[PDB]
Amino acid sequence: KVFGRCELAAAMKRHGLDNYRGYSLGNWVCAAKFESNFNTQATNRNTDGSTDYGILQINSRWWCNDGRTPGSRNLCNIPCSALLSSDITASVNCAKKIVSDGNGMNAWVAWRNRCKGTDVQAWIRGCRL
């Protein structure tokens, strides 16, 4: 599923990301735009052979099992395919663990390089929330 910008902001709010660990909703939406273009089926291979999955491009090196990432972990206890669902509950729940792991949203290099310190509230401007 390819979400619209306000559609995604609403589903993230419902599943509790708004101000989770202090990150306003526009931070989450900006991260989703640059990680996946709001597409839940996005996948991208990393140079180390891990893969990133779904709307927030969660990596199989640490967070989900894809069966083909040697020496990796599964800290969210899910198959990475779960992270491609039109239902974003699994990605959100796993994201809450990631952003609690100590580096906040810097875990998302696209967030650090394209969202951090910008006017992220523009990403939810006008959204009936």
Q: Is 104 in the site for Cl ion (CB under 5 A)?
A: yes
**69 interface partner picked from Na ion, Cl ion, none, CB below 5 to 8 A per type:** Na ion
For residue 67, give the 3-state DSSP assignment: coil
Q: Which listed range, 4-12, 26-34, 64-72, 100-108, lies at the site for Na ion (CB under 5 A)?
A: 64-72
User: Among 97, 30, 20, 31, which Cα is nearest to 64's?
Assistant: 97
Is 7 annotated as catalytic?
no
Task: Compute the distance between CA of residue 86 and CA of residue 13 in angstroms, rounded to an integer.
Answer: 16
Closest CB to Na ion belongs to which residue?
A: 72
CB 64 within 8 A of CB 58: yes
User: To the nearest 5 percent, what fractions of the chain are helix, strand and coil?
Assistant: 40, 10, 50
Q: Which one of the listed residues 35, 48, 87, 119 is annotated catalytic?
A: 35
| Beta carbon nearer to Na ion, 12 or 42 | 42
Q: Which one of the listed residues 7, 52, 66, 119 is annotated catalytic?
A: 52
Q: Is 79 in the site for Cl ion (CB under 5 A)?
A: no
**81 interface partner picked from Cl ion, Na ion, none, CB below 5 to 8 A per type:** none
Interacting residues with Na ion between 3 and 62 (CB under 5 A) = 60
Task: Compute the distance between CA of residue 73 and CA of residue 9 in angstroms, rounded to an integer.
Answer: 29
**60 interface partner picked from Cl ion, Na ion, none, CB below 5 to 8 A per type:** Na ion
Strands (E), 5-125: 43-45, 51-53, 58-59
Point out the residues that are catalytic.
35, 52
